[PDB]
RNA sequence: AACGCGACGAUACUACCCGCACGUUGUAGACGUAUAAGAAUAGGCUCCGGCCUCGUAUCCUAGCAGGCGAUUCCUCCGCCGGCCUCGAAGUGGCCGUCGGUAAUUCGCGUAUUGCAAUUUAGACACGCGCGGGAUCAAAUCCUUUGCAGACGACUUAGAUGUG
RNA sequence: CAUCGGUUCUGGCGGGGGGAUAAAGGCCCAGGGAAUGUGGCUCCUCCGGGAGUGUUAUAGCCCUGGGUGUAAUACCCUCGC
């Protein structure tokens, strides 16, 4: 949902006279910009932890960069989102070159798909496939097939919509 | 002899005066310019001057033709339309009417 | 059917500002009277709802199992 | 984006209301449009729903009397076109009405646009909007089932013009050959000098 | 010739074979490690 | 037994497949992403016609005949420029028709005024030569 | 259908001129002077034009007849002309029996035939502005209903707010274009047969 | 009863047409048009055999 | 789920010849030519090997995929036609009234035409006329059976089919009323 | 369809047609207001060699708003006439005469509209003029009829006759 | 029309800073490894190509660490023309 980066957020509650060195606890949190990886991070401490914001402090916040956005990997993502039915699991594969389009991809196909909005979506892994062994859904195995070479049959020519009438009728063989 | 054309304007059609949904303002005239599609091809007509020519019934002062004047403003929308003002706001019976979008003034 | 043929009167979809009004405050009202059901409701709720678990599909399960099982086995140990 | 007199559409692969949004703002913007071979003209979907909509369209109708003001419905497929096209239009306003009379309709191709260059609207063509698989009807079908009386005249007076037309791009083929032999002979007699200069300018 | 009946005795039908449209993605043989190991895993 | 099948053959989108972009430099298909995307590499010494590693959508791309041959999947800058040099793919993309319609194009974009008033006399004299020319040719048949 | 031209026979009676006048006791009856010379000039040129333009471009060839209304009792001297369709054969063997036609009297019995069952078309009898009682046959109200009792009592009980194009209404009754079909010929009788 | 506008009527009208009526009327026909045909018989510029000329608007005025 | 490549295969006998041009479908053998347009399905057509004709879809929904196994049987039945052509036998029963077939070939049209009479004691002449390119004729070898062959395995059948249902029993309890004209066998002529 | 259309007959005048002579005449709007294959789009085009994303094309386009005279060229344009041809609401082709015509090169002229001010310039229609060619018509009231009719309207007759 | 002032829209250009002192990437260095296994080898063929073996060979790829390197570029912030 948005032009996603990645996010290391690093978080504690407040020290005290009792526990004068807190817990440091790290969150890799999918948001547009900080302010809403640092809400985010707050939501789920608050869902886990019982550790509210005014309580705590954020220590770090840092941008995970992809090592190889030039490389062609397969992703599996299990996730688990919410319907008026209740929470439903799932493992869905996406074909990407970084773990953050991969996420923008699965919120889109979740939105597609089962009307789901980013408010009722947890991500609870990314992985990247190690092998294509791994790879398990059809959809993507059909892509990592050997030799794998297609056409592009009936494509609609790209023409200037401002240009309104054209004297010879288009082709679609290229 | 000469077989050419003596056009040293851009032809141009008024459209529609600068409106919302109901509300129409005359003091801003919306022009197609002839083969300007987007913004940055419009940019080029900027100040230029825009003159409708039309025809009345008497002759005043050796013509039976009468000239309103105006410039071109800004751009309008994404496709190239561009807003103009004239001395006088042009007629409503234009909609769909031709203008002379000159050459000058030139930066050229 | 012959609808084809002989079609008969359409269905509006033009819908009625009366109709409109009546729906939306029978709408709030369904609202607050689930709310209120929801208060008075006697039926049994538990504390922590069932989990999900790791789907089979998740081709690192074992792994996750794995990991799982050396996090309690050190969080005994410690304590 | 151009200017010109008349613009002349061929109707055949259009789709009716995309060709009639697209010809009613060329109309309001004061451009000039004759559309030929409007039982040419495509709907999306099923024939079976374009028939079951002209039932619909038919059964409407001013209950006091026939004869006055109720929707008077027109089979010939320019009007079907045309009723398309006047939905888009304020028509019951002067400057709507002005742009309606910039309108031209014809079911086949009549005198003289079949000498004169048609255009196509690839906004519009059906080739290149519809998804392939997806169903259409053509609307001479359409008003040959709800009574237009005219498809068979029509259809024999297009074989007529086609059978003219293969005559005249006989001639065509043939002056094109004798042009691109003029070419050749002829591209010896040039002065060199003009042919690089030419070719460097890109001609 | 054939051999056998068709039941509806549309005699010249072919031998058809089964509709798998996803046939080919994967082994046989990696399919029954994946079955081992998800074993294990259950 | 004779089969005549007339049908098409298009091109097909392959490792090693050579696609024009839209502002008319090349690449070379690495590795398929989809049935919508591929990674592209365009190693070329051309400024024209460079463009670096990355996605390129196949609808804002074009399928050219030339074809590396036997380029490895997942190949890197290295190995793509070292199979691009050897190929040749600028002396053959120079060769195709749509870099003579490109260089065309930008040969009429790039006149001048004088230039076009050049180009209408000198046009005008050959024209005057293909005119007898078609004369001689329609007088004798 | 469109007409495309029409040709003429070289002389035409006076009964048939009187169709074109309204006040031909007072004219100069010059109708058809000017055309009647196209058989002169030039040896009918225009005239074989026009028959070879209706050979090659026309599907459908009518014949002009008109009545010889001077033979019958009727003080009428005006007679009435009609375009009657020549079926079968070719178009060109429909424009070559048409010009053998012209000038020539066609009787009854070349056209129908004892035994045949034919159409009649005709304006019926006029009966002037009549009631709904005799021009719709609707029921008599009771005796000394005020208001009248020739009439229909409710024209409108229901919606639309308007008298609806079904109700009957009084007006002109008669005078009215029939077709009327399936009629058999019991004899076609001959003038000159003392015994018919 | 069966409608006027029945398919069986229909067809057998078409049948009593083809088989019954048919070849009476071609009979009448042909001693009608041959009585009425008794009756009957009893430069291409300058010469009129090329068709020349004769001696609201479909497009707008240009 | 959109699948990259589907493809089937038609073997072709060394006795035919297919042309394929536009998805219009020509099949020729020894006992003549048939013809087909399948044109309203999505398919590219190939010579993947010697006698052997290949179909495929590309980037095609489960439908498209599917669509290509009614193309190879409807191209696979055009080929048996036109060597081994098809057969109907029928087969017409009563109770007390015989049923009377007359067959007859109309040289205006070129078509066969069947007339029934007698159907239960009714005075109506039934007609049945033919598809072309099929041969109706009476068998000589059993007792009340008419043959349908052609090369058009849909021609031949949909003519049995309209002389089995213009010999219907109307208001009848056909429990007791067995009378009519039925498809008794189908298989090849050769 | 009384604001849809066609064919035909006769059309007196200030009516009709032709040539030019122009409009304080008009028109939802000229300014190169240039350009005919058909058909398919999981296929097409071809000169048969090949070619197809692409009209970002082709044609045309120089001269006092385009002069005068050469040099030079046989190319392009236009009006008439002949023969054909074109009916979906009818117009093109070939040939011939005549007139114009930088594909090349040159001389004489342009000023002064004063530093821009619509570049008054096209087409159709309408009107007033001459100078010619062509043509001598109808309708209505009125009287009458009753196939008609509230009144209008309608069917008829009224010029020498079968009145 | 030129030169200005006020407000505003819009286009381009030269710098600075930050982050994993971007992440990548190219070219080198040193290890490790695998397949949608390159060459080679073996076995089948419709002679078109398949199947197997095995780790760079007559293609290449992936992982880790180092050098060029305070590399470039993207993104964000910012000083001006």
Redesign the pocket.
Known sequence: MGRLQEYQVIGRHLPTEANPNPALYRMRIFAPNEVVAKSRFWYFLRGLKKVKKATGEIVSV??????????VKNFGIWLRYDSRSGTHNMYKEYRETSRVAAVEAMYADMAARHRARFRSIHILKVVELE???DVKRPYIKQ??????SFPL??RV??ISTK?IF????????? | ?????????V?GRHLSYQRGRRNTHPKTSLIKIEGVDDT?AA?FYLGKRV?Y????????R????R?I?GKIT?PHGNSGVVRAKFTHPL????????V?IML??SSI | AGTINKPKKPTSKRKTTRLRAKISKRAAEKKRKERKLARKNPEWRSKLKKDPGIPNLFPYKERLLQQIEEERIRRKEEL | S?????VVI?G??HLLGRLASIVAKQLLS?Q?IVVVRCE?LNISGEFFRAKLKYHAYLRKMTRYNPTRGGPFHFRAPSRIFYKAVRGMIPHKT??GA??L??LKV???????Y?????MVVPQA?R?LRLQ?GRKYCTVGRLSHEVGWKYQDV?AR??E???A???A??ER??LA??Q???AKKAAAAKVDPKVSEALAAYG? | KNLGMRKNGQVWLPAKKAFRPTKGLTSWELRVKKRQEQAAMK | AEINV????WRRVEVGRVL?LENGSLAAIV?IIDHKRVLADGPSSDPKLAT??GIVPLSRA?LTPIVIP??????????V???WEAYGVDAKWKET??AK??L??ER??SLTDFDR?K???L???R??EE??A???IKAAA | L?????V?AEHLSDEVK???????????????????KKYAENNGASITR?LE?IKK?CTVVRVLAHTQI??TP?????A?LMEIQINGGSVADKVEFGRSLFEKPVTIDTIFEKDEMIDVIA???????VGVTARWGTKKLPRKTHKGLRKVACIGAWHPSHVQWTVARAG????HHRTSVNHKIYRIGKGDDEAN | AKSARASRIKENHQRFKKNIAGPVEAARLERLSAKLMAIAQA????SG??????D???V??? | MRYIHSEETIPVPENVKVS????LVTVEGPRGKLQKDL?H?????SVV??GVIGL?????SRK?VAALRTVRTIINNMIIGVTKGFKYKMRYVYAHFPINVNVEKNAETGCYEVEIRNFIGEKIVRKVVMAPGVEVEISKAQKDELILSGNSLEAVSQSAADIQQICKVRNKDIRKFLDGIYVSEKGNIV
Do not use: C
């Open positions: 840092n941008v995970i960069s992809e090592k190889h956005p030039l490389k092998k294509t062994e892509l990592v097939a050997k030799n794998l049959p009936h020519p790209k240009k054209s004297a010879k009728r288009p082709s679609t063989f290229s | 002899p000469s077989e050419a054309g003596h056009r040293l304007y032809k940055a940019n003159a020519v039309y025809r009345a019934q008497k002759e005043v050796g013509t039976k033709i000239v004047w800004r007629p409503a019976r234009s909609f769909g009417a031709s002379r000058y003034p | 151009s200017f010109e007199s008349v061929d055949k692969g004061g000039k040419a002067a400057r002005a742009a009379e910039r014809f079911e086949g191709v009549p005198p003289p079949d000498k004169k260059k048609k063509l080739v392939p029509v007076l297009e007529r013009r086609k003219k037309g293969a005249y791009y065509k083929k094109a050959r042009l691109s032999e001609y | 007339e049908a098409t053959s024009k590795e670096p590693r074009l036997k380029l490895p999947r997942g190949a890197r800058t290295g190995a420029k070292k199979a028709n749509w319609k490109q065309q194009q009429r974009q008033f180009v209408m006399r046009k005008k004299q024209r005057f005119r007898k078609l004369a001689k | 469109r007409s495309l031209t029409t003429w009187r169709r074109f006048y309204k006040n031909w006791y007072k004219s100069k009856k010059k109708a058809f002077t000017k055309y009647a026009e333009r471009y001077r033979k009727l003080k009428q001297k005006k009435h304006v019926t009898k006029g009966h002037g502005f002109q009754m008669g005078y | 430069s291409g510029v300058k055999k090329s068709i020349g000329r004769k609201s608007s479909i707008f005025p240009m | 394929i041009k536009s998805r044109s399905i999505a398919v590219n057509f090997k010697k495929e879809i590309h980037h095609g498209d």
